[PDB]
Amino acid sequence: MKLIIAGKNNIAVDVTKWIIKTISDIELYSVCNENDHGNDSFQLSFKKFCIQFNIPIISLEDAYHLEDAIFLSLEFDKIIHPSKFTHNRIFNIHFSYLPAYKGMYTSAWPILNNEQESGVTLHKIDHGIDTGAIIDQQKFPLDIEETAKTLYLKYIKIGTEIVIKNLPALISGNYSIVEQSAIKSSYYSKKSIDYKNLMIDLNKTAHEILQQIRAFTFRDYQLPRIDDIDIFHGEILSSKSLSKPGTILEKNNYHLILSTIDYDIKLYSDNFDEILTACEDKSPEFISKLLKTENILFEKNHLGASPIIIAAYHGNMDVIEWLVSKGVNINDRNYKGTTVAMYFKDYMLRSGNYTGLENLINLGLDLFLKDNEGLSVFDYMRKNKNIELFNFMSTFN
């Protein structure tokens, strides 16, 4: 039996990995998105992965002709018409709790509309947009400071889990379906948000504006920009200016304060670059006063470098420990899968200071992770003939 995975990003990669691991009786095929040109970013290129793992890449037109197959879309970019296949084993993951939020921008709209929850849905593909019957779905709450990025990452994670949970049933044909209700069905088109001329409506309440701010916060794509300042989170003040909504009450390097329909708002300028630099050699005290929101402690640059990665590469031990205490992952990775341990190893090698490792191991540092090339820190130390450091690191269980 053939399984065609059509789509992109870590959902398509991780689903495909689980299949390779778990279901060896299956002949796998890939259909990729037009904009996937082989470059990893915040999400892995499914194209690059398939080529490296010897998964044959086929066109959509080819997939139509494959008989004895299941077809599974995961953030795929082309409309699929059920009529064009010999069979009805055509499945999709959509990033909403259907029937709500059919269509586009499902990491923004629920936030813009102040939903309490969202979810992910596995359903049949039918001819229309996210209209087909439901096989399974899972819901989750939206956090108070949820952004489009944090939301999208929850969708990737939950979607991957729902596919793996259901795939044996999709394969066996032993699943149930329920037609989507018309009631509380909703849809947004690509015209509904112009990401290339995004404007925040300031003639609104504090809460409405901060909803918009957070819905448009997705660092890899954009930050919201107000009065020529990139914004990273904000807060609602207790003051209530009489000035027209949108009036700039205060503007400095740190923030803007605006009048709204109700309560004044304070919008924090983005200082992520400054946070990264500070993590090289400054104290947790210093950093705690530089940041305006603790959200900034979990941000990543275009390579995936985070505060804790920088701290680790520079052997800034007090900052590593402090970040961990704020809930940062001691085993964080950049976008190539390089781990905190690998960066810390670099510091040990460069400095000759091995004394900090034990502390990190006790805080949960995992030496046995593999990066996107399938190599561990040990594989690198061996390749580079850093045998003394290898052997030192090897003493930790």
Ligand X SMILES: Cc1cn([C@H]2C[C@H](O)[C@@H](COP(=O)(O)OP(=O)(O)O[C@H]3O[C@H](C)[C@@H](O)[C@H](N)[C@H]3O)O2)c(=O)[nH]c1=O
By CB under 5 A, name the binding residues for Cl ion: 33, 35, 77, 380-381, 384, 386-388
- Applying the rule CB under 6 A, the residues between 81 and 110 that interact with ligand X are 94-95, 104-108
Q: Residue 241: which of K ion, ligand X, Cl ion, none does it interact with, CB under 5 to 8 A by kind? A: K ion
Choices 119-127, 216-224, 236-244, 351-359 (CB under 5 A): range interacting with K ion = 236-244
CA dihedral of residues 274, 280, 282, 287 (deg, nearest 10): 40
Residue type, 357: L
Distance CA 379, CA 104 (A): 43
Q: Could you tell me which residues come within 8 angstroms of residue 273 by beta carbon, excluding any fewer than 6 positions away?
A: none
Q: Are 89 and 80 in contact (CB under 8 A)?
A: no
The residues binding its own copies (CB under 8 A) are 99, 102-103, 113-114, 127-129, 131, 180, 182-187, 189, 203-208, 236, 240, 242, 261-263
What is the widest separation between alpha-carbon atoms in the chain?
69
Q: Which is nearer to Cl ion, 159 or 307 (by Cβ)?
A: 159
Please list every residue from 122 through 161 that binds ligand FON, using CB under 6 A: 125, 127, 129-130
Tokens at 233, concatenated: 């989170």
- Spatial distance between the Cα atoms of 111 and 121, rounded to a whole number of angstroms: 18
The answer to whether 180 contacts ligand X (rule: CB under 6 A) is no
C-alpha distances out from residue 193 to 27, 138, 210, 215, Å:
40, 26, 17, 11
Q: Residue 255: beta bridge partners? A: 268
The reply to whether 324 sits near ligand X by the rule CB under 6 A is no
Q: How far is the CB of 135 from K ion (least distance, A)?
A: 22
Q: How far is the CB of 134 from its own copies (least distance, A)?
A: 13
Question: Shortest gap between Cβ of 240 and K ion (angstroms)?
Answer: 6
Residue 105 touches which of Cl ion, ligand X, Na ion, none (Cβ within 5-8 Å per kind) = ligand X
> According to CB under 5 A, which one of 137, 259, 334, 339 is a site residue for K ion?
259
Burial of 371 (0-12, 13-18, 19+ CB in 10 A): middle
Q: Is 46 in the site for ligand FON (CB under 6 A)?
A: no
The closest residue (CB) to K ion is 259
Let me know: does 246 contact 277? Beta carbons within 8 Å.
Answer: no
User: Is residue 258 part of the contact set for ligand FON (CB under 6 A)?
Assistant: no
Give the other-Cβ count within 10 Å of 258's Cβ: 26
Residue 395's Cβ-side half-sphere holds a number of Cα atoms within 13 Å equal to 8
Binding site for ligand FON (CB under 6 A): 73, 76-80, 104, 125, 127, 129-130, 189-191
Binding site for Na ion (CB under 5 A): 41, 43, 45, 135, 176, 190
